[PDB]
Coordinates of C-alpha atoms in Angstrom, one line a residue:
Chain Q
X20 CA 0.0 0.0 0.0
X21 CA 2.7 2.7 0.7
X22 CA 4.5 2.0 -2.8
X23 CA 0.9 2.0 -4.2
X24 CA -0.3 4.9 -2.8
X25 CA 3.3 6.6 -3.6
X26 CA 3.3 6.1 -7.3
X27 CA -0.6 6.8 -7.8
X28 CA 0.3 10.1 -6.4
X29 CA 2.9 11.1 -8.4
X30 CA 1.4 9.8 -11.5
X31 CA -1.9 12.3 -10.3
X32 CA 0.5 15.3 -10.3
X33 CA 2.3 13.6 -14.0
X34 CA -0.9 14.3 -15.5
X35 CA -1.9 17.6 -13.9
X36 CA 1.8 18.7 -14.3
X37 CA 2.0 17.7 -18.2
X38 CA -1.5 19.4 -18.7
X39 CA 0.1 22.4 -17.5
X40 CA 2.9 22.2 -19.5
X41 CA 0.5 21.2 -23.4
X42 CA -1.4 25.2 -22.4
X43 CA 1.6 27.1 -21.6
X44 CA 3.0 25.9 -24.6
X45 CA -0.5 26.9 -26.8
X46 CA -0.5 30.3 -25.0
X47 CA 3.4 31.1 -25.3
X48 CA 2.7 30.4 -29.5
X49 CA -0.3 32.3 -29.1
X50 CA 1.8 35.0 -27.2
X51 CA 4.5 35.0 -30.3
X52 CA 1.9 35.3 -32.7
X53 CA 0.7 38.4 -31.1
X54 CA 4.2 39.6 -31.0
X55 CA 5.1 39.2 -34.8
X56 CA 1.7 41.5 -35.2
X57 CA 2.9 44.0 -33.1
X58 CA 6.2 43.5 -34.7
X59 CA 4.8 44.3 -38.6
X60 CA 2.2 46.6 -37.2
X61 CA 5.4 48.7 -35.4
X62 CA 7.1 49.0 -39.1
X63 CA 4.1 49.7 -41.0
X64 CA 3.5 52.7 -38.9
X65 CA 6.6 53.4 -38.8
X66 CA 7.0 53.5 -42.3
X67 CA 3.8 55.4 -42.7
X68 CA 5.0 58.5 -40.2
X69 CA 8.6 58.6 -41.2
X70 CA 7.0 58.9 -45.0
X71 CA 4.8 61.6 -43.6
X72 CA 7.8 63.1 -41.8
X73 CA 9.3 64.0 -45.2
X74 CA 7.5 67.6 -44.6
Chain V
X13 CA -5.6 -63.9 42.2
X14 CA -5.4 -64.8 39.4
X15 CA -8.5 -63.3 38.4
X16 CA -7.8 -60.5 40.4
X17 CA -4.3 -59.5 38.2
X18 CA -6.3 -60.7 34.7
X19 CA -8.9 -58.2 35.7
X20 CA -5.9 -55.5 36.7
X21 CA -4.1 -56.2 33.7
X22 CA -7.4 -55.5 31.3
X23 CA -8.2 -51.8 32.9
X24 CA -4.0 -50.9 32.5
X25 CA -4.8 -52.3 28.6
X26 CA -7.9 -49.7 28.1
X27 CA -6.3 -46.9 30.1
X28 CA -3.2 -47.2 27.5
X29 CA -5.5 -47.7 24.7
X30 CA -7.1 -44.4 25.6
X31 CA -3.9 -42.6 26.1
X32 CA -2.5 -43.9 22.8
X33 CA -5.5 -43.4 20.6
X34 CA -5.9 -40.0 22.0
X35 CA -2.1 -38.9 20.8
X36 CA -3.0 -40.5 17.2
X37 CA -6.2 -37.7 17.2
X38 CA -3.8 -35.4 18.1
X39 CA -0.7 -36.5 16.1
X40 CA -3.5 -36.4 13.2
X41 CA -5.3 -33.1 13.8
X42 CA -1.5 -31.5 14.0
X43 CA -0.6 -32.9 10.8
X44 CA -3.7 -31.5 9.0
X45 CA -2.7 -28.4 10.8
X46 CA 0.9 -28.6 9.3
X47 CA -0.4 -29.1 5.6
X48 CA -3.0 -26.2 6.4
X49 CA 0.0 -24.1 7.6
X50 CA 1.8 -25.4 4.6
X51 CA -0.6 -24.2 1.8
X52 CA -0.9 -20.7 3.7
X53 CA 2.4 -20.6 3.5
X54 CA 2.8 -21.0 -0.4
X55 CA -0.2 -18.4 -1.0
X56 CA 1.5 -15.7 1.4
X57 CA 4.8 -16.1 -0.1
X58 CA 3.6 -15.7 -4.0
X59 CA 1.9 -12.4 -2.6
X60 CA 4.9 -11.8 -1.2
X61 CA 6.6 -11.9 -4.2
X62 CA 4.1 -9.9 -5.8
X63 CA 4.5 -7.5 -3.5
X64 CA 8.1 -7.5 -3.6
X65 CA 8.1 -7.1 -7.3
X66 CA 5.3 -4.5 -7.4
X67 CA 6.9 -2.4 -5.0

């Protein structure tokens, strides 16, 4: 019973612990996805003001 | 007196008899126990090993 009870523990916090780690995966991609927009929005407005900062 | 010791004699025989067919019940009842113990024995050892090897 103590190795039992030992092991179904650990495996509990396996799953739980691997379940954390599959969404903070999704959410850091999700995270650099949102980052490359910022990124090409930054340049295009950029672009746009340092075009309109001719005169 | 001779009748007397024949008679004498013939209680000692059934007082031995009773003695001696009382330790075969018992000599018989213990070996039944020892098998009993015996088979016990080989179940509590394989879960023993199962144990062992699970743990």
């Amino acid at each position: 019973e103590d190795a039992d009870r030992k092991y179904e523990e650990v495996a509990r916090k396996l799953v739980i612990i691997e379940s954390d780690l599959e969404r903070a995966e999704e959410r850091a991609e999700l995270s650099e996805g949102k980052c490359a927009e910022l990124e090409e929005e930054l340049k295009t407005v950029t672009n746009n003001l340092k075009s309109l900062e001719a005169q | 007196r001779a009748q007397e010791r024949l008679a004498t004699a013939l209680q000692k025989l059934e007082e031995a008899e009773k003695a001696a067919d009382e330790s075969e019940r018992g000599m018989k009842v213990i070996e039944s126990r020892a098998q009993k113990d015996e088979e016990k024995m080989e179940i509590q050892e394989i879960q023993l090993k199962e144990a062992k090897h699970i743990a």
